[PDB]
C-alpha cells in the first residue's frame with residue numbers, strides 16, 4: 080500500500096507507534112485506539128507526500144491541504160506530527176529546494192568535528208533548524224570514508240561503494256536528490272583456484288552450502304549449547320567455526336571406525352563358522368571311512384553288522400546335512416562382507432581443495448565484517464541482521480563522493496583543520512585545532528555544543544590524537560575499548576582495455592593457505608572505464624599495508640595473468656592502493672561487533688556527555704558533547720546510511736536541547 | 741535442532757574444547773584406533789583364507805547317494821532287530837531310527853515302541869542308552 084509503503088520506507092511499523100513517538104505523543108499512545116490510528120495515518124501520509132517528492136520542502140501548510148477529512152480536522156495534531164517528522168529528519172532531510180528561505184537570525188552555535196556523511200547530514204539539519212554550524216575537517220576534502228579516486232576518465236571508490244537494498248534505505252531519498260548513477264550488482268561470482276583454473280560448478284556449490292551449514296552450526300552452538308564463554312573469555316565466530324569443523328572431522332572418523340568394526344564383527348563370525356566347518360569336514364571324512372569299512376564286510380552278515388552299515392550311513396548323511404547348512408550360512412556371510420567392503424563411509428570431511436575454497440567463503444565474511452573471524456562476537460556478530468533493507472545491492476557508477484560533496488553545498492567547512500582538543504564545561508565548549516599543513520597555526524572555536532563524529536579508530540588511539548578536557552567518563556571509554564574497529568583495503572587497477580568478462584561484476588581468487596585467504600581474494604568490475612578493484616580482507620588487510628604498491632600490483636597482475644592469460648593482461652595505466660588502518664583520520668575502515676562487546680555499546684557510543692556544574696550547588700547542566708558516526712547507530716553500524724541516520728538523530732537531539740522541542 | 745548431517749553433541753563440544761590441544765588429541769586417538777581395526781581385519785582375512793583352503797574339495801568325496809525306499813507297513817524280523825539296535829543307540833530319536841531302517845515311518849517307529857515294549861524290554865533298552 081501507499082501510506083503503508085511510506086512507513087516501510089521510513090523504517091517504521093505502519094500500524095503501531097514507536098518508542099520515539101510515544102515519547103513525543105504520550106497523550107496519544109496512552110489514549111484510545113481510534114486516535115492512535117488517526118495519528119498513524121497522519122504520520123504515514125506525511126511521510127508519503129515527502130517521499131513522493133523529496134526535492135522540495137514539505138511544509139506544514141502543504142501537508143494539511145493534502146490531508147482530507149476527518150484527518151485534517153485536528154490541525155494541532157497535524158502540526159505536531161509534521162514538526163516531529165521534520166525535527167527527527169524523516170522529512171525534509173538531504174538536499175531539497177527550500178520554500179521559505181532560511182531566516183537570517185541564527186540561534187545557538189555548534190561545532191561539528193568531521194565532515195564525513197554523519198557530520199554533513201547533522202550540519203544540514205542543524206542549519207535548517209536555524210543554528211550556526213561550523214564543521215572542522217582534518218583532510219583537504221569532505222566525505223571521510225566516502226573517498227572516490229578521480230583521474231582522467233577513471234573513477235573508483237576507495238571506501239564505500241555499495242548501496243544496499245533501496246527498500247527502507249535513506250540513500251534512496253538521497254539518490255533522487257543527487258545524480259547518483261546506481262547500477263545493480265549481479266551476484267554471479269566465479270572462483271578461480273590459485274592455478275587460474277575455474278572451480279567446477281559441482282564443487283563451487285557443495286562448498287558454499289557447507290559454508291552456510293557451518294554458520295548455522297555456530298549459531299546452534301551459540302543458542303542451544305550456550306557455547307559463549309570458554310576458559311573465561313568470550314567465544315568468537317572463528318573459534319566456534321573451528322570447534323564445528325573439528326566435530327565434523329571427528330564424526331567422519333567415528334563413522335569409519337563404526338564401519339570397519341562391522342567388518343571385523345562379520346569376519347570373526349565367519350572365522351567361527353569356518354572352524355566349525357573344518358572340524359565337521361574332518362569328522363565327515365573319518366565317518367565315511369568307517370561306513371566304507373563296514374559296508375565292505377560282505378554279505379551275508381548278522382544283524383549287528385547290517386546295523387553298523389545302516390547307522391554309519393545315517394550318521395554320515397546327517398553330518399553332511401549339517402555341513403550343507405553351514406556352507407549356506409557361509410555364502411550369506413561372504414555376501415554381507417562384500418557389501419560392507421563396498422559401502423565405505425566418507426574418507427575426509429574436506430579435501431585440501433575443499434578447505435581452500437571454504438577459506439574463500441571465510442575470507443568473504445571477513446571482508447563483509449572488515450575483521451578476522453577470530454575477533455567477531457559469536458553471540459552478537461550478526462545482531463543487525465533483522466534490519467536489512469530489501470532490493471538488489473547497487474554500486475555508484477560515478478563515484479560515491481557525489482553524495483558528501485552535494486551535502487557540503489552551503490555549509491561552513493574548515494578543511495585542513497585537525498582538532499587536537501575538545502573542552503566542554505557547564506557554560507559552553509572550546510574546540511582547539513591546528514592547520515594540518517603547518518601545525519603551528521592554532522585555532523580556538525567556542526560554541527554551545529560539540530558534535531563529535533570522529534571515527535571509532537581515532538577515539539581508540541593511544542596515545543590520543545584528540546584530548547577531551549575533562550576526560551571522557553569510563554562508561555564511554557570502556558565502550559570505545561570493547562567495540563571492534565576493523566580494516567579492509569582496495570587496489571584500483573586502471574587499464575586501457577577490458578580483458579575480463581564484461582557481464583560479470585565479481586570474481587574470486589582462491590588463496591593457497593588460510594593465512595593468505597583474504598589477500599586479493601575478490602575482484603570487482605563496476606565502472607564505465609576499464610577498472611578492476613581488488614579486495615584485501617581479514618588478516619591480510621593489516622599485513623599488506625606494510626608492502627609497497629608495486630609489489631601489491633605485481634601480485635594482482637600475477638593472479639589475473641593466471642586466470643586470463645599472460646598476453647591478455649597489459650600493465651595498468653593507473654593504480655591506487657588504500658591503507659585505511661594507517662590513515663590517521665580513520666585508523667581502520669568500520670566497526671564490528673567484537674567478542675566481548677554487543678549492540679548496547681553502540682548505544683553507549685551515541686549517549687551525549689554532560690559536564691558537571693561550574694559553581695558547586697548550581698543546577699544540573701545541559702549536555703554539551705554529542706556523538707555521531709557509523710559506530711554510534713546500533714541497528715545500521717558500519718554503513719553510509721547508518722552514518723547519515725546518526726547525523727539526523729544527533730541534529731534532532733541537539734536542536735531539541737538548544738531550540739526546545 | 742542442528743543442521744542436517746552436522747554433528748554437535750554437548751558431550752563432544754566439551755571434549756574438543758576442555759583443553760588447548762584436546763581436539764588434535766581426540767582425532768589422533770581416533771586415527772590410531774582405525775589403524776588397529778584395519779590391522780585386525782588383515783589378520784582375520786588371512787586366517788579365514790587359510791581355513792577356506794582346508795575346505796578345498798567340499799565334502800563331495802564323502803557324500804553318499806540318496807536312496808528312497810518304499811515305506812512298508814509290515815515289520816520283518818530283520819527290521820525289528822534293526823529298530824532295537826537303533827533304540828539302543830539313538831534313544832527316543834524317532835527320526836534317526838526311521839532313517840536307519842529305511843522303510844518305516846516315524847509314526848510306525850513310535851507305534852513299534854508301544855507294541856513291542858514288553859517283548860523287547862524297550863524300557864530296559866532306553867535305560868541302557870541313558871547310562872552312556
Ligand SMILES: Cc1cc2nc3c(=O)[nH]c(=O)nc-3n(C[C@H](O)[C@H](O)[C@H](O)COP(=O)(O)OP(=O)(O)OC[C@H]3O[C@@H](n4cnc5c(N)ncnc54)[C@H](O)[C@@H]3O)c2cc1C
Pocket residue numbers: 192193194195196197198215216217218221222223224225237238239240241242243496497498499532533534537544545567568569659663664665667668669707708709710716717718719720722
Ligand atoms: C574500504 C571501505 C569500504 C566500505 N564499504 C561499505 C560500502 O560499500 N557501503 C557502505 O554503506 N559502507 C561501507 N563502508 C563504511 C562507510 O564508508 C562508513 O561507515 C561511513 O562512510 C563513515 O561515516 P562517518 O561520517 O561516521 O565517518 P567518516 O566518514 O570517517 O567521518 C569522520 C571525519 O572526521 C575526520 N577527522 C578525523 N580525525 C579528525 C580530527 N582530528 N579533526 C578533524 N576531523 C577529523 C575524518 O577525516 C573524516 O572526514 C566502507 C568503508 C570503507 C573504509
Ligand SMILES: O=CCCc1cc(F)cc(F)c1OCc1ccccc1
Pocket residue numbers: 238239240241243446447669716717718
Ligand atoms: O565496500 C565496503 C563494504 C561496506 C559495507 C559494510 C557494511 F557493514 C554493510 C554493507 F552493506 C557494506 O557494503 C555492502 C556489503 C554488504 C554485505 C557484504 C559486504 C559488503
